[model samples]
Target: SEAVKKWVNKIIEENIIAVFAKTECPYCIKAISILKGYNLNSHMHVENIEKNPDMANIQAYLKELTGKSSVPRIFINKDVVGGCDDLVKENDEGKLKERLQKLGLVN
Candidate 1:
């Protein structure tokens, strides 16, 4: 538990765009696909469920932190940005670009 928390804290702090996702999840796939249009600039961390050994613990920790338990738990500039649906909504409304520009991820 402590290790999971520590790892999450460190990784989140280091990454500008961190997404806890499952590769096979449709929501996660859409989120990643949208993010792919950006510069990324090595600041992205797409942690897939298939790759993580402690996914349950990680999800628990994230739930405690973000109040969400689903894949595509996105964090932009260390701030929780909700899941894929939220992401798509923001993008569709043209707010995603605003956020990305604010973060210097886009022009």
Candidate 2:
């Protein structure tokens, strides 16, 4: 269980952007689309939790970490930025893009 948090933390620290998503989730699709539209390429790391056998622990820890057990948990610069609707609002305001630019993930 401790290892689960450690691993997830390390994963986030290693990426400029990260997403915990379910492959078929509509919200996941939207979040991924918005991030991918930036053409971040490998700078954005995505985990399809549905395909991971260890997702229960992952999501459980996420629930503890974020207070919501939801798919498409998004992070940028190791900061939790909430789910799809949250992302939509941020991106719509150009805050999302601003972060990417500052991180040098996009132009």
Candidate 3:
């Protein structure tokens, strides 16, 4: 648990964009595609839960930290921007692009 917290914080703190996801998850795929569209894929930290031994542990920590239990948990600038559905909602509401522009993640 401590290790998961440490690792999660490390990734979240060090990266402007971070996605905690499972490799084959449909939501994860959509989230990745959306972020990539902003040219952030190259700089983002995307962790594949399917490939990590601490997958469950990490998820448990995330749930405790963010009140979210699903994959594609996204953090931007150390703030939880939310998951796939949230991202889509933000994009549709015209906030995602604005946030990205404000953070200089896009032009």
Candidate 4:
């Protein structure tokens, strides 16, 4: 329903770092680990779409919003950060923390 759109939009808008994850998802685990390594315990929104009965609908919208209907669809400052491996690549490339610093999410 359109309410899903509103809620999902709010989730992204309200958090500097938003991770739409599923419990026990390997990529979700990896994504969260990489984010935590950056040391932001707050300002990071971690939500398990699986916890909602509208999980399917939510992911469908995410697929519409991004490109894939996958767990751990990470967002930094409202920009799609793609998946786990993408996050890994970003960190290794030294762009992750810099963006966080640019957003003042980190020092």
Highest lDDT: which candidate?
4
Model 2 alpha-carbon miss at residue 11, Å: 1.5
- C-alpha RMSD by candidate, in order: 1.4, 1.3, 1.2, 1.0
Give all TM-scores, in the order shown.
0.90, 0.90, 0.92, 0.94
Residue pairs with colliding backbones in model 3 are none
Task: Flag the better candidate by lDDT, 2 or 4.
Answer: 4
27: Cα error in model 2, Å: 1.2
The TM-score leader among the candidates is: 4
Error of 2 at 97 (Å): 1.6
Ranking by TM-score: 4, 3, 2, 1
What is candidate 2's CA lDDT for residue 96? 88
Q: For every model in order, what is the number of clashing pairs?
A: 0, 0, 0, 0
> Tens digit of lDDT per residue, candidate 3, span 16-58?
8899999788999999999898898766999887698988888
lDDT of 1 by residue, 1-107 (tens): 89889998877888888888876888898888888777674778887855889988988888998998777799888888899988889889988899899988789
TM match of model 2 to true structure: 0.90
User: Please, what are the lDDT tens digits per residue for candidate 2 over residues 8-63?
Assistant: 89778898788999878889998888888888767888888888888899998888
Q: Judged by lDDT relative to the true structure, which candidate is superior, 1 or 4?
A: 4
> What's the lDDT for all of these models?
0.84, 0.86, 0.87, 0.89
lDDT of 4 at 87: 92
Residue 91, candidate 1: alpha-carbon lDDT: 88
Q: Residue 107: error of model 2 in Å?
A: 3.2
Q: Residues 1-107, candidate 4, lDDT per residue (tens digit)?
A: 79998999999999989999998898898889889888876888899999999999999999988899898898888899888988999899989988898998778
